[PDB]
Design a protein around this ligand. Sequence first.
Ligand SMILES: N[C@@H](CCCC[NH3+])C(=O)O
Ligand SMILES: [Ca+2]
Ligand SMILES: [Ca+2]
Ligand SMILES: [Ca+2]
Ligand SMILES: [Ca+2]
Ligand SMILES: [Kr]
Ligand SMILES: [Kr]
Ligand SMILES: [Kr]
Ligand SMILES: [Kr]
Ligand SMILES: [Kr]
Ligand SMILES: [Kr]
Ligand SMILES: [Kr]
Ligand SMILES: [Kr]
Ligand SMILES: [Zn+2]
Length: 316
Amino acid sequence: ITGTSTVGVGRGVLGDQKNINTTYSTYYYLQDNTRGNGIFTYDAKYRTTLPGSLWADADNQFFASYDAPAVDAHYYAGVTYDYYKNVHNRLSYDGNNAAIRSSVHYSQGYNNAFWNGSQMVYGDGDGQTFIPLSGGIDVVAHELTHAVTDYTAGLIYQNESGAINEAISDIFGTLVEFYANKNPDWEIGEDVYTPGISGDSLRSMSDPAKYGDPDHYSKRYTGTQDNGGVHINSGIINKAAYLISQGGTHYGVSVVGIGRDKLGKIFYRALTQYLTPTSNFSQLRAAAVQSATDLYGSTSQEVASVKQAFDAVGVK
Ligand SMILES: N[C@@H](CCCC[NH3+])C(=O)O
Ligand SMILES: [Ca+2]
Ligand SMILES: [Ca+2]
Ligand SMILES: [Ca+2]
Ligand SMILES: [Ca+2]
Ligand SMILES: [Kr]
Ligand SMILES: [Kr]
Ligand SMILES: [Kr]
Ligand SMILES: [Kr]
Ligand SMILES: [Kr]
Ligand SMILES: [Kr]
Ligand SMILES: [Kr]
Ligand SMILES: [Kr]
Ligand SMILES: [Zn+2]
């Protein structure tokens, strides 16, 4: 909508207060004009017609419980935009500041979130498996990273290329969580998953096996459910990325950690310059090795650690 840029205030899903960029024209809208072509947040009103209505509020205060998922979808899309711009010189998901659109209150008791090819969509959860999923910054950034992948490598969402697609979203979802630096970790979705259970998450990058996901190529799922295991076999790549950053010894193979920033640079370069729609795990290893070589040199510690990490998870 055409209007003047304003700053509202509200509370997110977890009860934290934050300021949000809004737009005023009779109503205050969740329309952030400060980032690219805009960040826009919509109300799906418990239905599945998308995007729904651009979020309108009478007084620029967003403290109602119904407001909370919108506040966080809006705010964390902003954080994610800032991450890609400041850390990777990427302007929104298409690199040309495409508008970022999100819808909240999708369906009823919907225990998921997704990128639908055009926008982000967040369920409210059923209150037992999930609370509203935009409450997790790693979730928001995971979903927006699917948009980045779709505009860059274009990894096909099945089998090994799909597992890489998923892992890329977990990796950068996690790196955005560290960037915002509010109790960050190497777990996925812990802030919105099972409110009645402390200390768990949907997936773990540090130990995928904790939730039954493979941490080695020899343990890969080869069946047909979950598009050939895209959320399952992602654990193999998530573990490799974790090892590259943090180091460790895994099935007897020791990896020297090189830290999160370099992990991010190596994988962002692989994603945008080397991976293709059909890339498999072996081809990811090659892309990561060549990316690290480009950035740090063929005899660098960084290249050695990438190789160690993929060795550790049995890839090549
Ligand atoms: N996002 C993952 C986990 C969601 C679990 C929903 N109960 C998937 O779609 O497989
Ligand atoms: Ca209000
Ligand atoms: Ca956290
Ligand atoms: Ca996390
Ligand atoms: Ca929990
Ligand atoms: Kr703001
Ligand atoms: Kr944007
Ligand atoms: Kr949209
Ligand atoms: Kr982005
Ligand atoms: Kr996620
Ligand atoms: Kr939760
Ligand atoms: Kr497994
Ligand atoms: Kr795999
Ligand atoms: Zn995903």
